[PDB]
Swiss-Prot record, chain B:
In vertebrates 3 main groups of actin isoforms, alpha, beta and gamma have been identified. The alpha actins are found in muscle tissues and are a major constituent of the contractile apparatus. The beta and gamma actins coexist in most cell types as components of the cytoskeleton and as mediators of internal cell motility. Actins are highly conserved proteins that are involved in various types of cell motility and are ubiquitously expressed in all eukaryotic cells. GO terms for cellular component: actin filament; actin filament bundle; cell body; cytoplasm; filamentous actin; filopodium; lamellipodium; skeletal muscle myofibril. It catalyses: ATP + H2O = ADP + phosphate + H(+). The modification N6-malonyllysine is found at residue 47. This is Actin, alpha skeletal muscle. It comes from Oryctolagus cuniculus. GO terms for molecular function: actin monomer binding; ATP binding; calcium ion binding; calcium-dependent protein binding; cytoskeletal motor activator activity; hydrolase activity; identical protein binding; magnesium ion binding. Polymerization of globular actin (G-actin) leads to a structural filament (F-actin) in the form of a two-stranded helix. Each actin can bind to 4 others. Interacts with alpha-actinin. Identified in a complex composed of ACTA1, COBL, GSN and TMSB4X. Interacts with TTID. Interacts (via its C-terminus) with USP25. MICAL1 and MICAL2 produce the (R)-S-oxide form. The (R)-S-oxide form is reverted by MSRB1 and MSRB2, which promotes actin repolymerization. Can be mono-ADP-ribosylated on Arg-163 by SpvB of Salmonella spp. This modification blocks subsequent polymerization and leads to cell death.
């Protein structure tokens, strides 16, 4: 059985091709007083943590190996030399980076075969399409990736360094401004939970602010680990509003609607209608209730007055990259695409592109 | 680019829409009402008290062609707002639907509705496709009927199909009955709709029924509150799981029949020894009456107890399974390799009714 390993900036998602979900989901962290993932989390108080995947790109290769070794031996309990292994990489991952990933897989782990797929392309596949534009928003990075018949269009790809971890930090900030105190790393973990549980994207931000200001209809309660119950009001929607107004955290970037539009505008005029009609959301930071409807409204306002816009937001989009890899690796038509160890031994580094 | 239509004709509900969509656009009651000319679906339902209601699709099989025509007409003109002469139309049928029945469906589509092309698929087969498989065994439990349909390389195996005349309508009826034991009163048609809502929202399948009963008797941890349309709040305890337990124990409603785990096993045993392993590893749940939380794990456990001690058992229960028949039809009718398989008006004219098979 082939393995699928989706290396995220915050979370590793890993499992077996043919399964409908990753068997293992754990943090992409390595800790020293070494420990990986959950074992590093459970010893948080005495460890210093490193994140080898920085904004989607692998930057610390020694620690990345530790993550991969942990994935195979501790999480999946497999010998890597026995399984073809599909790995994922960020949009615009440098060629040398991909080559190094490949070298480690073949030379350190001795995999019999491998393949490296672009994350957003796999999410597109998981939605049953080969043409469209993906918004992939994760923990450390957000990308817009337009794709034509399987090919990610590199000149049109946009990277935004605003994602899940920034939204968490911003919710800590504004909850504290309300009169709580969320500051410490343990308090960050609590706020991350509040974010995932109680936040949403308002269809109209100014209206939603007025509603919250006049009544308590939008309020929710939340029980802290120690039992103290607290109240979340307009923070519920001001937090993910940041995606649409990066100025909220002092960033000058256009918001996710405008970056989607700008990305489409960099593509060949003749494919743009297909992109607008096939906008797919993916990644954990696209999970906010209300996001698909807000994106529909926002892109309609930017796009030619006639254009047909469609947002696709799968329920399982926090795992759609992984799912796409699971589908792909299961196709009989894909089996000729694996890069084998024999092939790499002869052809060398070059073969992976 | 011409859109194809997908119409999934259920015992209780029509599911209808456009091939390529991820969900049916229209979902409405399979009812035709006439003054005590005719009303269909939601309007027939909302006008009950002045109409006589008919249900033309008994236990999955179309029994009244005049009324079924009215349903299809309403589906095209009122729900989907399409001229049927302009769209290839995929229709669905029950397991073991008689050949003359499929031929009648086809004759109506071509001669009354003037569809340019059409296809008829077995409902359970479409749900299998929707789960990404062409071999497996489907448990399809709807409003009026439940079937086990084993399928090998895309074809249902008729000799091994099991039909159980127990489904969603009976569970609703049984929940009303057991709620009455508590002193509640659910008698009217409006009251039955409230019980249907309670069932759909609060019911679940116990992993171990006798243990669940003990838990419910010794603690209030399984109880849920439900607000009635008139503001009154009632309490639901062990009725949450006694209701769908009926699926595993049809004696709860006085049926001598085997439960759904046993029919699944019996169905598999009617198939070639050489395919059984594949069937056990690909048991797909479909239909609204398979939606109860806990059903997959209980089925896994019961089938494990019945099957040879080595056997590898896997239950697939898609989140969207109340629509998976429709969804499979949407996918199939969207495929480039399916386009040849449409029966066109010309092929029908040249070959006669037999071509639909
Ligand atoms: C390296 O480079 C490649 C290039 C290429 C990649 C192939 C890729 C991995 C995938 O294999 C495909 C994309 C495949 O898609 C799949 O295999 C899987 C698809 C899934 C779960 C789709 C759902 O997300 C979808 O829900 C929203 C279901 C939903 C429900 C009802 C209607 C449908 C409508 C859908 O078009 C929206 C489709 C028409 O049915 C559609 O998908 C069911 C059909 C489907 O071929 C059966 C796709 C054609 O939509 O090949 C590789 C070999 C090498
Ligand atoms: C009239 O006679 C026919 C006979 C035949 C019908 C074909 C049918 C309509 C379908 O087109 C296919 C069954 C097709 O399946 C599909 O088109 C659609 C599939 C979907 C939404 C699957 C999900 O439900 C699934 O979730 C649980 C996703 C999930 C996620 C991860 C991994 C996968 C694992 C899956 O094997 C479980 C597969 C390996 O990926 C699988 O399906 C993604 C691949 C898939 O080909 C891309 C199927 C091969 O599992 O042809 C017609 C032309 C004529
Ligand atoms: N239901 C939810 N609502 C809001 N945010 C969520 C939800 N679920 C997860 N997230 C956020 O999604 C992020 C993780 O998503 P994902 O697994 O797609 O990221 P990654 O792949 O690790 O990061 P990247 O793609 O940036 O490298 C976390 O910031 C998490 O808090
Ligand atoms: N979430 C749920 N939990 C339990 N039961 C449900 C749920 N949702 C729907 N049902 C029941 O499912 C039944 C309808 O399912 P479905 O649409 O598959 O049936 P159908 O195709 O009309 O009938 P049949 O297949 O018997 O001809 C109704 O009895 C309904 O109450
Ligand atoms: Ca985990
Ligand atoms: Ca503190
Ligand atoms: Ca409806
Ligand atoms: Ca034909
Ligand atoms: Mg990611
Ligand atoms: Mg049905």
């Amino acid at each position: 059985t082939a393995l699928v390993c989706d290396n995220g900036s915050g979370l590793v998602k890993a499992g077996f091709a043919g399964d409908d979900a990753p068997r293992a989901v754990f943090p992409s962290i390595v800790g020293r007083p070494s420990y990986v993932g959950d074992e590093a989390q459970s010893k948080r108080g005495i460890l210093t943590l490193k994140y080898p995947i920085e904004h989607g790109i692998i930057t610390n290769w020694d620690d990345m190996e530790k993550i991969w070794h942990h994935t195979f031996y501790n999480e999946l309990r497999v010998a890597p030399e026995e399984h073809p292994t599909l790995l994922t990489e960020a949009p615009l991952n440098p060629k040398a980076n991909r080559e190094k990933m490949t070298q480690i897989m073949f030379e350190t782990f001795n995999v019999p075969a491998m393949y490296v797929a672009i994350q957003a392309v796999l999410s597109l596949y998981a939605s049953g399409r080969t043409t469209g534009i993906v918004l992939d928003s994760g923990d450390g990075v957000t990308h817009n990736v337009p794709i034509y018949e399987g090919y990610a269009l590199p000149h049109a790809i946009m990277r935004l360094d605003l994602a899940g971890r920034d939204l968490t930090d911003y919710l800590m900030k504004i909850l504290t401004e309300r009169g709580y105190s969320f500051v410490t790393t343990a308090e960050r973990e609590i706020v991350r939970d509040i974010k995932e549980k109680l936040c949403y994207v308002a269809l109209d931000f100014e209206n939603e602010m007025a509603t919250a200001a006049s009544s308590s209809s939008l309020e929710k309660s939340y029980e802290l680990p120690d039992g103290q119950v607290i109240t979340i009001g307009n923070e519920r929607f001001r937090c993910p509003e940041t995606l649409f107004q990066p100025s909220f955290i002092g960033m000058e970037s256009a918001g996710i609607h405008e970056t989607t539009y700008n990305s489409i505008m960099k593509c060949d005029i003749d494919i743009r209608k297909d992109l607008y009609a096939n906008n797919v959301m993916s990644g954990g930071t696209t999970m906010y209730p209300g996001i698909a409807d807000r994106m529909q409204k926002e892109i309609t306002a930017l796009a030619p007055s006639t254009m047909k816009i469609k947002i696709i937001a799968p329920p399982e989009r926090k795992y759609s990259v992984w799912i796409g890899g699971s589908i792909l690796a299961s196709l009989s038509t894909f089996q000729q695409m694996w890069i084998t160890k024999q092939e790499y031994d002869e052809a060398g580094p070059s073969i992976v592109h």
